[PDB]
């Protein structure tokens, strides 16, 4: 459910909670940057639905929107490049057999990031794909794909490999998100065994700016 | 309240046991320390509580080294899988009895698991190319130490080599390069004080 | 006292393929690896490959890659070998041996008495 | 890849006479991780094989002191003081740092 | 544009803004109770991004989403039966040929209804036509349709005559709502000359609590 | 500042002319006085603004009796349509040179336009019927004094009839009720001293 | 619907005689708005007719004093106190409180 | 002086439509309806209908409904009939007539020439 939102300065942004919780009686909110601590933001009472700011926090900023029956949405007005980072959706829970109140249950995280946004042109991710060395299957007889994707300005991106059905998930290393220029370039690789190349392989990739709001599917030969 | 990690980059072979550090400062008489592992998929996932009155607690292949009047807790993971390279955080949590209490984190360590210490293996070489882009790849190599060098006479942009782990066990390099004359590349691995071309094996 | 012990022997028909098994007792299983080397008679020895019993980690030789597979049965403390496309030539001693860390030093520390394998 | 190759392949020694056997590689034994390693193996006829020299230098325990090893780069060599009437049989030195594994050619020990 | 909205006790409600102006300046938000004049709630200042409640207002209570570039939506908290009535989003306009400050620009205005919305049921429109007398075209040389709606909770019901194609808008009267134990009722009548009843005539209700979240549309017979 | 009218219904004939009075207490030097017009459907159209330093300003079909001292505003409304049947509001308007000033409502008042004083007319009278239900439609009769009468007896319930103005320029009746007995009903209309039944046109 | 009737349809009198036309309708004239409509017409032959008596009593500027009209529910009453020569033609009584505004049969004017 | 005026006569063929004007001055043409009237020869008059030009409302006579249909033109000052499906009992003497807000008193305050309309 990991998710990336990029917003101009003095925009607002929304930020939704993963949690599927159910008698909820305090949401918490935790902004984590790089190289710094996590550390809370606010916390929301729904029981009289206020939402309570940390000393040192400007009033005016945050907001705990509550759209529908346990599910949470937060508001950030006046984004400045300080906003960026991730934020979790959190909460306590309550009550056990037996009575540890052994954690404190985390949501899955969204990345937020925070852009001038006015001189930026269409970033979705461009896939330029390779095809299997036949001088690799000649030998060591197996086939490495590589599915090469650059011009992402949104580094959070999702790719994993599925063959031709989602059922069939491969394992495919991937290396390290590479800056060029204002812009990122990712690519990844399979090897496939003798009993697999009679099949096509797709990269599904998922990230926030990519065509037609849906992740990308890209077909690869047989 | 306020919790240091100490230790900025951890790295440990498969099947050992690593061990991170906590220091903490704070005022309450009972307390709780968490630990708490975020994967690169940012997923902040409960990994064990130690209760301040109670011993040492043991949770699947955590544990907690704690001592009262220590006031530093120690995380021990034992048969290092390859799939805990993660960071970790430490945090320290008022009385859980309210509902309002946070937790404060710490800076939190990394965590990587190299493979086991193996015997060498000599690298396969191989060339993919799709337009003026240029792939080497390079397979089953366990010295991390490697050089990978592409020879030709337009390079326009490079980058650095992405070095990763295989489920077989050993490295597998990839890098990546633009070239005009894609078809006049060629690959030099300097391996183990061995060399390796690409046309080697064609 | 460590002990592994093997099969005495084995006769099957050739193009069937054959499992041989290596029991372990007296030591940590899960600490060693163990190493499966064949013999040719009137020749020495050579290497088949190394199985991790604690993460499964399996390595071959080149030429036997594919015709040997290596498995381990930690529940009851065995490893077993599975031989494919058996003919003429793949009769041999075959010997299962316990290695170390390779970090504080590597050596066969035991032998079994092998499984001399007749096509 | 990694061969090995034992010079004499074959030694018919009386007793009490010290003997050397040396095993040459084609590429250095130096591991990167600070140790080199290569097997003295001893094979007596009819029964399994028994390690007598491990890691060039060191001996396994159990076995008696007139066994001894040294050598570096590429050229090792196995030395006897005193040679038994138990320490006929066959020889291999055996390479771990290159995976193959390669073991020796064999050297045989006899008696004159 | 006109909608309605109803929300339970406690919950929270959204009322959009349906002003399509660009570059404004201020943004004020007018209630229209029933029985009582209209009055300001709060202006949203989107120089500063802030918004400045009418002195008398408990600060926590509303709210002005920008969720995108000139697009505003108030959030209410903490409803209870008072804050019924009907939301206007207004503004100001600036300059002019002749300055005149001629007038304040008003929004279309949604309605709102708070109820208690545990025990309600399904409450969407149920259509029980009505067929043309004989006898009344039998000399009348006309035919008068009826359809009429029963059993529906909101009020605000738009029943307009489309016959079978939108572009043929037919002049309908329509009888005031009438209020049966707690739900309400409507009926509209068409009357067509001779040559009209050649075709299929709709009358295409809208409302909030209708089924499928679209308007329903009733064939008739020719 | 408070602003009331007075009115709370008036109603007009078509093509004649209506007034609204606007009563208010102000405070400030120089003010402005709105009109708006809500439909049925709630739009709030802006109607006319009179300057207060200005004289007697006219707009279209509205105009506005305005003097200084006078404390009081009439809007007189010329040659009335058939959808002018609104609520009309009062506004108060702060200084506009600011941006932040807001209008001051009155309760408003509300207008209808009834169709012109006409000759007498027969109504016609029919039956519809579709399941229990039965609705009895009244055409074209001027006099809005009338009397639907269902005849029947199995009465369930019952709804007040409604009384619309037809485009044609006369009044149009339906009432409706629910009948076991659907093909029993009789409609009576008691309309201009005189009496009118469904079965008189069959 | 209403429909009008005149009881003489025809009058031969003769000059300085007063004469009086009544008509009579189906259905009462008071309308609603708190009036009674009946026009009393004169059509002098070969020209267009000309409006003598609105609203039953008053009477149209630039008619002689001798015209008058009286009545009241359904039945009215044209009164001509003095007959003279500009007199003769025909004469309506014609409702409008009911739209279908029915005329009158016609009464003939004539001399003896 | 209030005036109005029509065509002197006409003469058309049976089955044509024909189109008959009233045209009105000397007055505030819109404060007044229009009521058109017809006369067969050797009979009462019979009312035709009435027209408002200020909404343009017109209301006809139940045996003419259909037959007739009346127009405005407000800019002209201009009342016209248009009479369709003509026969040979549609021919009599047509006249145009100005009424009151029949809230004040109502007649008919003045009459044209008439048409002698003929088949
Ligand atoms: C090199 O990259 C290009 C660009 O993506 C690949 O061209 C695509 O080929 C697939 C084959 O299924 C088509 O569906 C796409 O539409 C093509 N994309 C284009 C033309 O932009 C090409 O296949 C790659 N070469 C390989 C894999 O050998
Ligand atoms: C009486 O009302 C019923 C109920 O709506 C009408 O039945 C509908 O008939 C239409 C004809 O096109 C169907 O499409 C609908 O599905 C019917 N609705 C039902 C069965 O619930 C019936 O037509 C009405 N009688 C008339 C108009 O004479
Ligand atoms: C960025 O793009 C510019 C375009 O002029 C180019 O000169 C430069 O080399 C690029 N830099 C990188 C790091 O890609
Ligand atoms: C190491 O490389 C050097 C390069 O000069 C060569 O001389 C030497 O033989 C190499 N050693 C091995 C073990 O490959
Ligand atoms: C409301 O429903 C109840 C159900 O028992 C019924 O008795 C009552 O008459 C209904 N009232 C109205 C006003 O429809
Ligand atoms: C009015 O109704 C009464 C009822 O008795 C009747 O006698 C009278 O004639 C009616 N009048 C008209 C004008 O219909
Ligand atoms: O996509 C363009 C074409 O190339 C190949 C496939 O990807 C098909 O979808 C299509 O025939
Ligand atoms: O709706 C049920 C049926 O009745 C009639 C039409 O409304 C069709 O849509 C269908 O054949």
């Known amino acids: 459910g990991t998710k990336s939102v990029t917003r101009p300065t003095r925009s607002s942004a929304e930020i939704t909670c993963d949690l599927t919780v159910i008698n909820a009686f305090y949401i918490h909110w935790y902004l984590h940057q790089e190289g710094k601590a996590p550390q809370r933001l606010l916390y929301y009472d729904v029981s009289n639905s206020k939402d309570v700011l940390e000393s040192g926090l400007s009033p005016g900023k945050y907001y705990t929107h509550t759209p529908r029956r346990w599910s949470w949405i937060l508001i950030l007005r006046n984004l400045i490049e300080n906003d960026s980072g991730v934020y979790y959706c959190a909460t306590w829970d309550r009550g056990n057999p037996k009575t540890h109140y052994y954690k404190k249950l985390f949501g899955s995280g969204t990345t937020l990031v925070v852009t001038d946004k006015q001189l930026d042109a269409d970033v979705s991710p461009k896939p330029t794909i390779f095809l299997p060395s036949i001088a690799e299957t000649k030998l060591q007889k197996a086939g490495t794909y590589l599915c090469l994707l650059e011009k992402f300005f949104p580094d959070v991106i999702k790719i994993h490999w599925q063959e031709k059905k989602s059922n069939t998930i491969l394992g495919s290393q991937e290396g390290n998100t590479m800056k060029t220029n204002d812009t990122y370039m990712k690519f990844s690789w399979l090897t496939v065994p003798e009993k697999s190349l009679d099949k096509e392989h797709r990269c599904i990739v998922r990230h926030e700016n990519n065509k037609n709001g849906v992740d990308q599917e890209i077909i690869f030969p047989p | 309240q306020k919790v240091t990690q100490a230790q900025s980059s951890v790295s440990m072979p498969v099947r050992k046991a690593v061990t991170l550090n906590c220091l903490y400062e704070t005022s309450w008489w009972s307390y709780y320390i968490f630990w708490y592992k975020q994967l690169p998929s940012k997923e902040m996932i409960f990994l064990i509580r130690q209760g301040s009155d109670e011993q040492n607690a043991k949770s699947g292949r955590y544990s907690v080294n704690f001592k009262k009047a220590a006031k530093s807790v120690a995380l021990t993971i034992s048969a290092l899988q390859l799939e805990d390279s993660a960071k970790y955080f430490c945090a320290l949590g008022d009385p859980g009895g309210l509902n309002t209490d946070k937790l404060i984190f710490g800076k939190g360590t990394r965590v990587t698991v190299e493979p086991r210490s193996q015997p060498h293996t000599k690298p396969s070489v191989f060339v993919m190319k799709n337009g003026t882009n240029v792939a080497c790849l390079v397979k089953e190599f366990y010295p991390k130490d490697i050089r990978i060098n592409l020879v030709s006479s337009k390079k326009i942009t490079e980058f650095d080599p992405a070095i990763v782990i295989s489920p077989s066990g050993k490295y597998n390099a990839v890098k990546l390069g633009k070239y005009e004359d894609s078809n006049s590349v060629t690959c030099s691995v300097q391996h183990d004080n061995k060399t390796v071309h690409s046309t080697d094996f064609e | 006292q460590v002990q592994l012990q093997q099969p005495g022997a084995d006769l099957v028909r050739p193009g069937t393929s054959v499992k041989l098994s290596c029991?372990?007792?007296?030591?940590?299983?899960?600490?060693?690896?163990?190493?499966?080397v064949q013999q040719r008679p009137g020749q020495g020895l050579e290497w088949i490959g190394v199985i991790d019993p604690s993460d499964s980690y399996t390595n071959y030789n080149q030429k036997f890659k594919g015709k040997a597979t290596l498995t381990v049965d930690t529940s009851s403390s065995t490893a077993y070998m599975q031989l494919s496309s058996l003919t003429s030539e793949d009769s041999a001693v075959?010997?299962?041996?316990?290695?170390?860390?390779?970090?504080?030093?590597?050596?066969?520390?035991?032998?079994?008495?092998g499984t001399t394998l007749t096509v | 890849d990694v061969v090995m190759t034992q010079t004499p392949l074959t030694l018919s020694v009386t007793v009490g006479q010290p003997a050397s056997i040396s095993c040459?590689?084609?590429?250095?034994?130096?591991?990167?991780?600070?140790?080199?390693?290569?097997?003295?193996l001893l094979q007596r006829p009819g029964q399994s094989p028994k390690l007598?020299?491990?890691?060039?230098?060191?001996?396994?325990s159990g076995v008696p002191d007139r066994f001894s090893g040294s050598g570096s780069g590429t050229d090792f060599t196995l030395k006897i003081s005193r040679v038994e009437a138990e320490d006929l049989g066959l020889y291999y030195c055996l390479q771990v740092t290159h995976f193959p594994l390669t073991f020796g050619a064999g050297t045989k020990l006899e008696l004159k | 544009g006109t909608k309605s909205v109803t929300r339970p006790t406690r919950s929270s409600a959204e009322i959009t803004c349906d002003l399509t102006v660009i570059n404004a300046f201020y943004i004020h938000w007018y209630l229209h109770q029933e029985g009582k004049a209209p009055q300001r709630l709060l202006y949203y200042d989107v120089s500063n991004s802030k918004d400045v409640l009418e002195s008398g207002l408990s600060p926590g209570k509303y709210y002005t989403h920008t969720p995108r570039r000139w697009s505003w939506i108030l959030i209410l908290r903490n409803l209870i039966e008072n804050d019924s009535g009907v939301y206007y989003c207004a503004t100001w306009d600036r300059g002019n040929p002749k300055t005149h400050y001629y007038k304040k620009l008003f929004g279309s205005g949604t309605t709102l209804v708070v109820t208690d919305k545990q025990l309600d049921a399904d409450v969407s429109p149920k259509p029980t036509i009505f067929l043309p007398s004989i006898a009344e075209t039998k000399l009348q040389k006309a035919g008068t349709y009826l359809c009429l709606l029963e059993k529906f909770f909101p009020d605000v019901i738009k029943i307009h005559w489309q016959e079978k194609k939108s572009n043929t808008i037919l002049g309908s009267q329509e009888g005031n709502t009438m209020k049966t134990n707690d739900t309400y009722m409507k009926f509209s009548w068409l009357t067509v000359p001779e040559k009209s009843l050649d075709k299929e005539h709709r009358c295409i209700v809208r409302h909030e609590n209708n089924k499928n979240g679209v308007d329903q549309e009733i064939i008739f017979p020719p | 500042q408070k602003v009331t009218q007075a009115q709370s219904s008036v109603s007009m004939p078509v093509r004649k002319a209506v007034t609204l009075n606007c009563l208010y207490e102000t405070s400030w030097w120089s003010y402005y006085i709105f009109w708006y017009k809500q439909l049925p459907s709630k739009e709030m159209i802006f109607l006319i603004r009179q300057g207060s330093d200005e004289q007697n300003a006219k707009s279209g079909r509205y105009s506005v009796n305005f003097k200084k001292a006078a404390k009081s505003v009439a809007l007189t409304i010329s040659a009335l349509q058939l959808e002018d049947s609104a609520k009309y509001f009062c506004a108060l308007g702060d200084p506009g040179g600011l941006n932040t000033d807001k209008l001051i409502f009155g309760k408003g008042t509300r207008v209808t336009v009834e169709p012109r004083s006409q000759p007498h007319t027969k109504p016609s009278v029919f039956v519809m019927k579709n399941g229990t239900n039965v609705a009895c439609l009244v055409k074209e009769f001027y006099p809005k004094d009338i009397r639907i009468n269902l005849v029947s007896s199995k009465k369930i319930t019952e709804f007040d009839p409604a009384i619309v103005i037809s485009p044609s320029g006369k009044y149009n009746a339906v009432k409706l009720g629910k009948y076991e007995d659907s093909n029993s009903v009789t409609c009576s209309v008691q309309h201009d001293n005189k009496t009118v039944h469904s079965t008189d046109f069959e | 619907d209403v429909v009008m009737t005149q009881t003489p349809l025809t009058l031969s009198v003769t000059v300085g005689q007063p004469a009086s036309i009544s008509c009579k309708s189906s259905?009462?004239?008071?309308?609603?708005?708190?009036?009674?409509?009946l026009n009393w017409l004169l059509q002098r032959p070969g020209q267009s007719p000309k409006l003598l008596i609105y609203?039953?009593?008053k009477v149209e500027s630039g008619v002689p004093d001798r015209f008058s009209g009286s009545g009241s529910g359904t039945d009215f009453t044209l009164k001509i106190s003095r007959v003279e020569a500009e007199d003769l033609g025909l004469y309506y009584c014609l409702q409008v409180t009911h739209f279908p505004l029915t005329f009158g049969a016609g009464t003939k004017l004539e001399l003896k | 002086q209030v005036q109005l005026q029509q065509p002197g006569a006409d003469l058309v063929r049976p089955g044509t439509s024909v189109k008959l004007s009233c045209k009105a001055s000397?007055?505030?043409?819109?404060?007044?309806?229009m009521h058109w009237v017809q006369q067969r020869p050797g009979q009462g008059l019979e009312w035709i209908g009435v027209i408002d030009p200020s909404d343009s409302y017109t209301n006809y006579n139940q045996k003419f409904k259909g037959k007739a249909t009346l127009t405005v033109d407000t800019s002209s000052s201009t009342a016209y009939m248009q009479l369709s499906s003509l026969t040979s009992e549609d021919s009599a003497v047509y006249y145009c007539?100005?009424?009151?807000?029949?809230?004040?008193?109502?007649?008919?305050?003045?009459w044209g020439q008439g048409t002698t309309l003929t088949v």
């Open positions: 609203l039953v009593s």
């Open positions: 259905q009462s004239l008071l309308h609603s708005n708190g009036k009674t409509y």
């Open positions: 000397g007055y505030t043409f819109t404060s007044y309806w």
């Open positions: 007539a100005r009424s009151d807000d029949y809230d004040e008193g109502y007649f008919f305050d003045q």
